[PDB]
Amino acid sequence: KVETHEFTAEISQLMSLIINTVYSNKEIFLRELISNASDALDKIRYQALSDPSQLESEPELFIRIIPQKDQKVLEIRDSGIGMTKADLVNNLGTIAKSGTKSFMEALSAGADVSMIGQFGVGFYSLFLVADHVQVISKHNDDEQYVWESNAGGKFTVTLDETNERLGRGTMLRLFLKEDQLEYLEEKRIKEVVKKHSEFVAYPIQLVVTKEVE
């Protein structure tokens, strides 16, 4: 059951700008998504300080990076607070109208794209390396949903009947551009994490698939 929605115009504008930019330091996308994951984990930790049972849906707090070489997909999963269906529509398709406009104005003045996080819209940096994204999310007391975008003007939200259960949290599935496949490689991912994400309160786990010989 696929619900189609339209992006706020200025979010559409910024996705188009990012997906087309030729910026040469695209690895900063991973810092931004890890920072979003850490923020989500902060929120469930805050709730769990009052009510520890909120952790029981997924007791381990983590950020996990899962390259899917066969699919040309990079997944970034967290066990943070997650997003409801209404959140997905609101958080990703509408709110952040302010940050997107201020950031585009800053770009026109000469700002570096790596400053995107300071306007609160670092999520959209994923379009530096991906042309399509699914956001799978599960909030306590709500169902698991999938939000899907191709940087155009429409997104969809669907009850998730096809992905692994998250327990609680969010998984971004980045469909990488054909010239950005370096970010499926263990060595490259490690380099970028160590360079830009040294001060993160949660374990950053990398899933590596190796042949037994």
Ligand X SMILES: Oc1ccc(Sc2ccc(O)cc2)cc1
- Of the pair 91, 105, the CB lying nearest ligand X is at 91
Q: Tell me how far apart the alpha carbons of residues 21 and 117 are, in angstroms, rounded to a whole number.
A: 17
In the window 118-137, what residues touch ligand X (CB under 6 A)?
Answer: 123
Binding residue for ligand X, selected from 40, 61, 96, 146, defined by CB under 6 A: 40
Task: Identify whether the C-beta of residue 166 lies closer than 8 Å to the C-beta of residue 149.
Answer: no
Among candidate residues 156, 102, 129, the one with its CA nearest the CA of residue 18: 129
Q: Under DSSP, is residue 147 helix (H, G, I), strand (E, B) or coil?
A: strand
- Of the pair 78, 107, the CB lying nearest ligand X is at 78
Count of residues that interact with ligand X, criterion CB under 6 A: 13
Binding mask 72-101 for ligand X (x = CB under 6 A): ------x-xx-x------------------
Q: Tell me how far apart the alpha carbons of residues 157 and 104 are, in angstroms, rounded to a whole number.
A: 27
Binding residue for ligand X, selected from 4, 6, 25, 43, defined by CB under 6 A: 43
User: What is the β-pairing status of strands 73-78 and 63-68?
Assistant: antiparallel
Q: Could you tell me the smallest distance in angstroms from the CB atom of residue 149 to ligand X? A: 12
* 78 annotated among ligand-binding-site residues: yes
**Does the footprint of ligand X cover residue 107 (CB under 6 A)?**
no
Over its C-alpha atoms, the chain yields an Rg (Å, rounded) of 17
Classify the phi-psi angles of 136: left when phi > 0, otherwise alpha if psi is within -120 to 50, otherwise beta: beta
**Does the footprint of ligand X cover residue 197 (CB under 6 A)?**
no
Residue 175 neighbours by CB distance under 10 Å: 17
* 150 annotated among ligand-binding-site residues: no
Task: Identify whether the C-beta of residue 50 lies closer than 8 Å to the C-beta of residue 140.
Answer: no
Binding residue for ligand X, selected from 12, 36, 54, 144, defined by CB under 6 A: 36
Q: Which residues are annotated as a binding site for ATP?
A: 36, 78, 97, 123
Q: Which spans of this chain sit near ligand X (rule: CB under 6 A)?
A: 33, 36-37, 39-40, 43, 78, 80-81, 83, 123, 170, 172
